[PDB]
Amino acid sequence: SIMMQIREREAAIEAIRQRKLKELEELGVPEEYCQALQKKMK
Amino acid sequence: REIVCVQAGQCGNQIGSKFWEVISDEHGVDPTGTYQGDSDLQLERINVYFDEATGGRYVPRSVLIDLEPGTMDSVRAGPYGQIFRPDNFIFGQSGAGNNWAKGHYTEGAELIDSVLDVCCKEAESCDCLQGFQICHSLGGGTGSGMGTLLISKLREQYPDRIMMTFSIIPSPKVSDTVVEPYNTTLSVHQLVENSDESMCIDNEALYDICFRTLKLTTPTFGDLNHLVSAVVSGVTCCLRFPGQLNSDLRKLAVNLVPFPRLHFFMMGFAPLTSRGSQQYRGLSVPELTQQMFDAKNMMQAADPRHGRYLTASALFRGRMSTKEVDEQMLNVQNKNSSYFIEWIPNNIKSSVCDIPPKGLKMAVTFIGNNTCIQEMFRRVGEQFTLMFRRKAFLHWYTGEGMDEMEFTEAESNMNDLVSEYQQYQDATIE
Amino acid sequence: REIVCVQAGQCGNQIGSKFWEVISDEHGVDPTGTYQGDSDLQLERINVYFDEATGGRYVPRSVLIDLEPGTMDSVRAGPYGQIFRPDNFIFGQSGAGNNWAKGHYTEGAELIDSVLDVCCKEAESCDCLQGFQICHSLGGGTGSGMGTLLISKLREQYPDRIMMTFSIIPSPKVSDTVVEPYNTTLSVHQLVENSDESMCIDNEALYDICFRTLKLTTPTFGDLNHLVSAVVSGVTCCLRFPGQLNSDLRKLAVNLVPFPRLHFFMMGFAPLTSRGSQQYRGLSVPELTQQMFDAKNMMQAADPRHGRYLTASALFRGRMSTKEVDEQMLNVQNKNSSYFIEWIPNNIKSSVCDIPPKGLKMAVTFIGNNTCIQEMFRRVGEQFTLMFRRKAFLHWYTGEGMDEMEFTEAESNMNDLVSEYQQYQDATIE
Amino acid sequence: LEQIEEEQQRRLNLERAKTLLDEQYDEVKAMNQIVDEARCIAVRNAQI
Amino acid sequence: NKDFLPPSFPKSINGPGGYSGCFQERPYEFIMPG
Amino acid sequence: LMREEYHPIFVTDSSERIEYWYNKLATQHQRENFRRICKEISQQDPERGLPKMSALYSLQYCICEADSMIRHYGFMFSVLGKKLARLWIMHDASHRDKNTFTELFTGLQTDFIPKSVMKTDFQPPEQGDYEGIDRSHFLSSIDWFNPESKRNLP
Amino acid sequence: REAICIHIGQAGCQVGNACWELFCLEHGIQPDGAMPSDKTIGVEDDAFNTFFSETGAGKHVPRAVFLDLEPTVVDEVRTGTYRQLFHPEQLISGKEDAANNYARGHYTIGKEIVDLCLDRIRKLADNCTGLQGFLVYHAVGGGTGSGLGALLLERLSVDYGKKSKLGYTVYPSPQVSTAVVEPYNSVLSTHSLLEHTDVAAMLDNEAIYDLTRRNLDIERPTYTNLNRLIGQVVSSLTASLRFDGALNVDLTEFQTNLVPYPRIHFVLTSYAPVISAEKAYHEQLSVSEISNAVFEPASMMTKCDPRHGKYMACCLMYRGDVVPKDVNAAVATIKTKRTIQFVDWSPTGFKCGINYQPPTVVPGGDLAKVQRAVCMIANSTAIAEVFARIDHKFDLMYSKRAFVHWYVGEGMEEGEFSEAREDLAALEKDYEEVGAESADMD
Numbered sequence A: 001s002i003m004m005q006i007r008e009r010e011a012a013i014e015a016i017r018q019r020k021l022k023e024l025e026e027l028g029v030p031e032e033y034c035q036a037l038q039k040k041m042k
Numbered sequence B, C: 001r002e003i004v005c006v007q008a009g010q011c012g013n014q015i016g017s018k019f020w021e022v023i024s025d026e027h028g029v030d031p032t033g034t035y036q037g038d039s040d041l042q043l044e045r046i047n048v049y050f051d052e053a054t055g056g057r058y059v060p061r062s063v064l065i066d067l068e069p070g071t072m073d074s075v076r077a078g079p080y081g082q083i084f085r086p087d088n089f090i091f092g093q094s095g096a097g098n099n100w101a102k103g104h105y106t107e108g109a110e111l112i113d114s115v116l117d118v119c120c121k122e123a124e125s126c127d128c129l130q131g132f133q134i135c136h137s138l139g140g141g142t143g144s145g146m147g148t149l150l151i152s153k154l155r156e157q158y159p160d161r162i163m164m165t166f167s168i169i170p171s172p173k174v175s176d177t178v179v180e181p182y183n184t185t186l187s188v189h190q191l192v193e194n195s196d197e198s199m200c201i202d203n204e205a206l207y208d209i210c211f212r213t214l215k216l217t218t219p220t221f222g223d224l225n226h227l228v229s230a231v232v233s234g235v236t237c238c239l240r241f242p243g244q245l246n247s248d249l250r251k252l253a254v255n256l257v258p259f260p261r262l263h264f265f266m267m268g269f270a271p272l273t274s275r276g277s278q279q280y281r282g283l284s285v286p287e288l289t290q291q292m293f294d295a296k297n298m299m300q301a302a303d304p305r306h307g308r309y310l311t312a313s314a315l316f317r318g319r320m321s322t323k324e325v326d327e328q329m330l331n332v333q334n335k336n337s338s339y340f341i342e343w344i345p346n347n348i349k350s351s352v353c354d355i356p357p358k359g360l361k362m363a364v365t366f367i368g369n370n371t372c373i374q375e376m377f378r379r380v381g382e383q384f385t386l387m388f389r390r391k392a393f394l395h396w397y398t399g400e401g402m403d404e405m406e407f408t409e410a411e412s413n414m415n416d417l418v419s420e421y422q423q424y425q426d427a428t429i430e
Numbered sequence D: 001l002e003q004i005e006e007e008q009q010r011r012l013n014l015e016r017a018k019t020l021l022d023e024q025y026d027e028v029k030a031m032n033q034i035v036d037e038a039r040c041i042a043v044r045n046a047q048i
Numbered sequence E: 001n002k003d004f005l006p007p008s009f010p011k012s013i014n015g016p017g018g019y020s021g022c023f024q025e026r027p028y029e030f031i032m033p034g
Numbered sequence F: 001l002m003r004e005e006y007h008p009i010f011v012t013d014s015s016e017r018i019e020y021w022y023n024k025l026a027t028q029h030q031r032e033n034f035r036r037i038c039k040e041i042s043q044q045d046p047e048r049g050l051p052k053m054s055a056l057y058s059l060q061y062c063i064c065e066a067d068s069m070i071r072h073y074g075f076m077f078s079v080l081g082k083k084l085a086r087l088w089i090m091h092d093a094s095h096r097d098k099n100t101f102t103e104l105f106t107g108l109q110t111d112f113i114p115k116s117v118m119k120t121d122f123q124p125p126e127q128g129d130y131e132g133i134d135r136s137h138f139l140s141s142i143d144w145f146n147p148e149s150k151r152n153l154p
Numbered sequence G: 001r002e003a004i005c006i007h008i009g010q011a012g013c014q015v016g017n018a019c020w021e022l023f024c025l026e027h028g029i030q031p032d033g034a035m036p037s038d039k040t041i042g043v044e045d046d047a048f049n050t051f052f053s054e055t056g057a058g059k060h061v062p063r064a065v066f067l068d069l070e071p072t073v074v075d076e077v078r079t080g081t082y083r084q085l086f087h088p089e090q091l092i093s094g095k096e097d098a099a100n101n102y103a104r105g106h107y108t109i110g111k112e113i114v115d116l117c118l119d120r121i122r123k124l125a126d127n128c129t130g131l132q133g134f135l136v137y138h139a140v141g142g143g144t145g146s147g148l149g150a151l152l153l154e155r156l157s158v159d160y161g162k163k164s165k166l167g168y169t170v171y172p173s174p175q176v177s178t179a180v181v182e183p184y185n186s187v188l189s190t191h192s193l194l195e196h197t198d199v200a201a202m203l204d205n206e207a208i209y210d211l212t213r214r215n216l217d218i219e220r221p222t223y224t225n226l227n228r229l230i231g232q233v234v235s236s237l238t239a240s241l242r243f244d245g246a247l248n249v250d251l252t253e254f255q256t257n258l259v260p261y262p263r264i265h266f267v268l269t270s271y272a273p274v275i276s277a278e279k280a281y282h283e284q285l286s287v288s289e290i291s292n293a294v295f296e297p298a299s300m301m302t303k304c305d306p307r308h309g310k311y312m313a314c315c316l317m318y319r320g321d322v323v324p325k326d327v328n329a330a331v332a333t334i335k336t337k338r339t340i341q342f343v344d345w346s347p348t349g350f351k352c353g354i355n356y357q358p359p360t361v362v363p364g365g366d367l368a369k370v371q372r373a374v375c376m377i378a379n380s381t382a383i384a385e386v387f388a389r390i391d392h393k394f395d396l397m398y399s400k401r402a403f404v405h406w407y408v409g410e411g412m413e414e415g416e417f418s419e420a421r422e423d424l425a426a427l428e429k430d431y432e433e434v435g436a437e438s439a440d441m442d
């Protein structure tokens, strides 16, 4: 059961990954810095 | 068996927001107020901390008081803030100025009637009232002045009930406020007469808890207030869940307090351990007791090794055997016998509760009455004596109206408290 | 068992328009006069306030009097104005000038015969006549003078019936009229001899009701007159609907007035609460009883904490247990026993009526007989004595024709009323 | 329609509370740090 | 000097039978022989 | 897996629990063994006879083992499924097969919801086994007012 | 025939839960109060009558009351599995606990609830025709058990008079301890219990823990095991009322035979075939081995060593397939031993009982199934050491008035502490005089 819980937590982290990257693009970070930043986010 | 909570000042309101988050989580109440729990055991004692609204909703039995609305607006803006009853928010229009005498005498008497009307209205609705629970700092302005004012009024109006306080106290290394010794000394003077039991926590000790035990890289006040909210919700757990050996705030007081002035206690919470390490060690009673008594895990700067235990209490949550609890408390008392006061044959009370907090197999909270608390009072009295001979900042308080004899009385009474602790520490049967 | 209403002056005519709107709405009478209700319970007591005109129609048993038709034209232009009988509007050609002597003696004696002729024509048509009901202000000119004139004439002509008045009285902080103390003193002098029951309301207390309890941003006179119409229509509810414990105006008088001069009462209506707060607290008989005695919810500036209750009455509308009523009245009498006059063994009467006002599940109106009313009379008598020693505006009244001894008689009667309240407040069995 | 309004009000309130609670963890604090840095560098570039 | 205390809520039933919320709080009085 | 043909072997309203456990937290090796074991009991003889062995002690051991296992892990099994699993345990199951069956169904059954210590296997309602009670030693109070009562019968 | 059970406080209610579970399973009453209906009629039965009464539709209800000051444990009983067995009036609950204060139980809070309890007990005693005693279960270490137990036994003793009262009592263990104020409550309890009880059986949790570790193979025991063992003991003593046997034993012969002088009424308890299921199938369990077992201190359920004292009387209860001649041969062999000593004034040291019903097996239980068992109750001077050590702990606390302000605040004079402690001192002096061998002319 503990393994199931941590897997779901990691999935939630991926979801907030996508949401935060989209929000950051919405604010208006310049494209080259945004690309380098999202590359170092992995 | 229901408690009424009061949260006063910035520290009290901030800790309170996390406390009511923890309690709402424990009873499965959605932040909209709808019950969404998954066992009847959650519902059957919801009355203890919540009042019932009609359709879905539950409302939390708490009064919020502050002198500037900034904090109140912050808690209302928080994720659970809507649950609080709007008529229960009481605030003024100008600050305490970090001054005890202004906060106690000028705006205190102006606001105090409106807080008592709400507190009495909430108390008199209960079918049987258990003690009050108050969170505040002693070093502040509204915390010290309005907390002790309200404590005195509730002790006048309900002298047969229990009065319980949680209190934050100044660190030994760095001050957050310049005038901390005056506010602390006057507030402890008020508490030792008025209060029944007062708990003290040092923020420096919480930082050391976080860094050594939890190893957080970048802790925030949310973490410190989560640790505090966890223990606060834990002490009352046996009041509000079934168990093999029930306990009660009054039952704690009768077993913990040997003499009525000796009611200041130390705190710790045991199953703190990082999520990475938890895979390497299963929970068991020897592990919990060994971690539980390690001074690394105790939430005050004073260390037990300089004093002796008069009494202690341990409240266990989880499904566990009584044999291991009893024999561990015997072995620990026998092996470290010089640190336990010898004219009491067994210093530790145990209690066992069936329902642990979610995601931990077991937990214990520890309550300790130890004489090493005397060094804190001595240090505060020293700093007070340095400030008082020269009236270093005294004109603010005297301009509000206090006579200096109040300051000399409070110093003398605290010094006598230190003497009483020292005499009982070195007493012997002869 | 039918009541006849009289509305006099601007305040009386305005409150009356809202009263007859509320009553006509409660019985489902269209503003054309056609019955459109949906239960027989509405029809079976319609006679109490309405007379029947031919082919279906109902007409409301009210007499309208004013000295300048401006108000009459405003009420006639209103949404329900058409219902009123044309022959029932009586008006002159010049105003009262806010002068009691003018309103009583010069235009009063000129018009008064036509009002008595209409009231007698309406009264002699009834098969059995119950008391009269009058709405007016005491601070005005035509309201005070002609209201008390008409009261004296009706008490001469119908001494065996009941005389009931609802009356608006001057605020302690701001006057609406400069000569208020004279008009108030002379009118209260007339009422205390002539009246059987008189109701008093402070506009300042209704404003504080609106702002503190209802939190209205921009209240208007329609709201004030709705609160008044709510209490007014509540007092008569047991006259006109079935219930578990019926009550009557005479039954109210017999239980409320211990001695014949002490007949001035305070009013309140309980389920007042803002639309935002209503989600946090459900309606129940304990909640209504707890709110009902809170001085925040009382419609006079005097607060119960400065006096003692001689007697009180509560009329409940709604489906509810007698058990809850009994324990609420016992608990309030036992816990606050020092604020209740000790030589009366039970000060509160209860009554229960089946039919609540529309859109509320239940409601109660509260009537209280409290000695703190003496502070109002002392204040008015003080201001009267200050003005009279200096002849501040007396030439207007003397030019109309009043003898100066009337003012000294009225002052003496107020001083004796204050003395009687003060003696009964501090009386003891010995 | 009152039921629909009540349900949608609960849905919005619950979603707002949920997204307010999710920033109390510790990964999100470091990610706030890194977005501030990205912001700090970009504004600095414009200043030159 | 005693502030006004508004009335309290009715007491709930602790169990079937008993004098928790009745009118008469005291159950009865035991009578010693004699 | 085959959802349609597996209704009567299990209880009526447990399909969602089986689906949730199989999809979400079932390990790969665990689900391999799960479908293998489900297949191997699902084909058992509904009326297979008792095993025959040269030792009566071994026969008693096998029968009591099957009875204990079925009375234990049959929290959500049906009567036909219980019978088939009992026959498989006595006849076809090996040591590792029994261990794997227990490993699967201990996680399949459980719920991990906290419950009070008295209700936790201290005071459960016992099954129907009151037959066979030795009733020859209880006292009998004879009735003097009715000589034909069942009480007076020796 | 009939007996009435009174359960007080937390330990007494939980032991009651274990007892009534066991008594139900032995008679065969289903938890809804009925009996199976598919069996042959045969002939009717009456053994339940000692513990149950029937209404007439054949539902069963038990002769018990449950008394507690906190709601939680009785509400747990109300919501559990046996909800329909008990009459709801029988489950009596107060509002708030006695907080380890004898004064709180006795003067302030128990005084309100006690008259309802007495009215319920009266209602039970009126529905009887051969009542032959009260059984009481309580612990003397806690506040409500001490205070309300004393008050209720005093009232019962005035109202019912001569009727016998037998107590099963959990005393504070000599070094395992659970609360600080245990000595005060135990002394003050013992003062009331001295006057108003006919036999008191003493139990210590440390002994049952030792027995479950050494004899049973349980690494992590909990209160349910101990409470079920106590229930088995009570079932063994009350079996003599309920089943056929060679030598029956009514509850009044215990009281007449075990107590030599009116203050000397505290007895030791032990149980012989405490054995695990895996050992039980490797061994026969004949009479002489279990008779030898009940006298070994490894068999006792109270933490005292009888080798430091002298026995005054022993009562041995055998149940199951036992023959009187074999019990006689065993008891004569025990009597021969030199490390077993009787006071020289007690020549006929033994009482025997022989019952045919073997001990019952509980589905979740930890005892093995055995064809025979023996249970022993004995009166011995070694018990004087337990009171002396409790009194010593009292002297340690009372020398500095360590906690007295709670008791004085809740309504009790300080003098009452000294009176009770002096009465227990007199009990030690009584145990010194009664225990002195013979006498002299000078």
Ligand SMILES: Nc1nc2c(ncn2[C@@H]2O[C@H](COP(=O)(O)OP(=O)(O)OP(=O)(O)O)[C@@H](O)[C@H]2O)c(=O)[nH]1
Pocket: B244, B245, B246, G008, G009, G010, G011, G012, G014, G015, G069, G070, G097, G098, G099, G100, G101, G139, G141, G142, G143, G144, G145, G170, G172, G178, G205, G223, G226, G227
């Ligand atoms: N054998 C056994 N002993 C118990 C049990 N529960 C508590 N005890 C013991 O009894 C003593 C505590 O007494 P309690 O029954 O908790 O006291 P109480 O009757 O609840 O009195 P209050 O605390 O005022 O409510 C300690 O010595 C415990 O070890 C139990 O379930 N079984």
Ligand SMILES: Nc1nc2c(ncn2[C@@H]2O[C@H](COP(=O)(O)OP(=O)(O)O)[C@@H](O)[C@H]2O)c(=O)[nH]1
Pocket: B009, B010, B011, B012, B014, B015, B096, B098, B137, B139, B140, B141, B142, B143, B144, B168, B169, B170, B176, B177, B203, B221, B224, B225
């Ligand atoms: N644990 C905790 N302590 C706090 C918090 N905020 C302030 N403090 C402490 O409280 C003291 C300041 O008191 P304060 O609340 O400002 O007093 P007030 O001005 O009367 O409200 C200092 O010791 C701070 O370190 C908080 O959120 N959590």
Ligand SMILES: Nc1nc2c(ncn2[C@@H]2O[C@H](COP(=O)(O)OP(=O)(O)O)[C@@H](O)[C@H]2O)c(=O)[nH]1
Pocket: C008, C009, C010, C011, C012, C014, C015, C096, C098, C137, C139, C140, C141, C142, C143, C144, C168, C176, C203, C221, C224, C225
């Ligand atoms: N509550 C209420 N009070 C009113 C209303 N109209 C006037 N008043 C009050 O009555 C007093 C004035 O009396 P008024 O009716 O003008 O006397 P009149 O000139 O003789 O008719 C003042 O205190 C006003 O505030 C109204 O519609 N509602």
Ligand SMILES: [Mg+2]
Pocket: B246, G010, G070, G097, G142
């Ligand atoms: Mg208890």
